[model samples]
Target: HEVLLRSTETGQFLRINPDGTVDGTRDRSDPGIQFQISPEGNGEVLLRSTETGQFLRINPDGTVDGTRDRSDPGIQFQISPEGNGEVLLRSTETGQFLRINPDGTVDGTRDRSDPGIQFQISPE
Candidate 1:
């Protein structure tokens, strides 16, 4: 379940900091950016940060952070594969896609052609 999620457009790894902030990084071998995707047995997965051991959560107010609570459904996410070896990170809370803009990190875009929505994941 260990993997590295990198942005196809920016060539940066999806990063999680110790302070629970999410962003992109050019650090290819950084542990904070690596994740262990754990399945919840219902087609949902919790993205667990390897260095910090926190699950990726998207709050109702659209704040994406890390948390230790496994009971919260906000931490659950759906993995979707786009065509041509790309993947889409979707939130199970309200079906918002994880859209990492070249300028910033965000969500709520339904545009599949948006380059920010496409990611390439490699095994860690």
Candidate 2:
């Protein structure tokens, strides 16, 4: 129930699915997107890399979810106070904003200074 969007000067968006699948960018250039899960059964599909500065997460049902920059991987996110189960996120990459639901819908966003976000979908 989660989806993610990642970008770079590479001229395309990296689309990540909740089931550990990927589209919209080749695994050759920036090979960070991965399919995996956490021990808690939460989907942790990643859209990150050690080279580029992109970072994102996908959930179980395949829905655009959370956003962050992978400069140092310090994105801060949590469930909303309104109880809609939406997540509130802030990236350490210039303190930009991101909001996503449990089902992987993005709420809002702004452009970053430099590069953008990757990851492993599951822990395994």
Candidate 3:
């Protein structure tokens, strides 16, 4: 179950570094950037990083955080399709869109105005 998320803003794969920080990278072959999606059973998905066992989370302040606690509501995301092969990852806790900024850093924002939040999910 190899899954990778490609950002529409940076045209890069969402990657989790060894230190648990997340960023978008152009390299597709990095297994550390890979993820496994698991259903949370409430129309939400848990994105588990292959590089680390941590789950992707949207912190209260809007920064991207990673934790091994699957019980955390911040780690749950709702996959919203935007058509044209694009989708938005909305945090269950904050209801913010998961955004890959132009600088390649991941963040969460309440503004859906930016198309940068849109991502293309693909099989890695």
Candidate 4:
């Protein structure tokens, strides 16, 4: 079963498991909406955010290990691992989405305009 929670201030989405542990979280604040997650069976956390637009990626070890944030417009990011982990951020200024890499690097691209479109598995 899948359960969801909302942030008191921004009303973002926070997923929870049966044990009371957080499964994932999304930034529903500022101008963009982004989310980060620690899968039930994987340490590699999945991050989804809107940097210049909407983007998604994975963070290993719960650290900003390989992530980048220009903080365009307004950025909201959170690592499910408590500290660094994978950073999932969304930007309202440019509407771009970004993710953190295991090597402490950044992957993903900016969506550019505001038509609200585009998606890629890699940052190429």
Candidate number with greatest TM-score: 3
Q: Single out the weakest 10-residue window by summed lDDT for candidate 4.
A: 115-124
TM per prediction: 0.88, 0.25, 0.93, 0.20
lDDT minimum window of 10 residues, candidate 2? 115-124
Residue pairs whose backbone atoms clash in candidate 3? none
lDDT of 3 at 1: 77
Candidate 3 per-residue C-alpha lDDT over 1-124 given as tens digits, one digit per residue, 9 for 90 to 100: 7788998776888887777788888886776678898898879899889777788989888899778877778998989888988999999888988999887888989998986798998986
Candidate 2: where is the Cα deviation over 4 Å?
1-14, 17-54, 57-82, 99-124
Of the pair 1 and 4, which is ahead by TM-score?
A: 1
Candidate 4 residue-wise lDDT, 1-124, digit = tens: 2122233233334322222222223433422223333242323323433332232322322222212432322323322322332222443333344432223233333543312111222221
Q: Which tens-of-lDDT digit does each residue in 1-124 have in candidate 2?
A: 2233333223233444443333455443343443222121232223343223334543322223334433333332222222332232334333444432233334334432223322112231
- What would the per-residue lDDT of candidate 1 be over residues 1-124, giving only the tens digit for each residue? 5898888898778777898888777877777888998988788888899998998887766667788988887888888887787888888877667777786574445566789888898996
Give the clash count for model 2: 26
Q: Each prediction's Cα RMSD?
A: 1.8, 12.4, 1.2, 16.3
- CA error at residue 60 for candidate 3, angstroms: 0.7
Every candidate's lDDT: 0.80, 0.33, 0.85, 0.30
Error of 3 at 75 (Å): 0.3
By TM-score, highest first, what's the ranking?
Answer: 3, 1, 2, 4
Q: Provide the lowest-lDDT 10-residue window in model 1.
A: 103-112
**Superior by lDDT: candidate 2 or candidate 4:** 2
Q: Candidate 1 local accuracy as lDDT?
A: 0.80
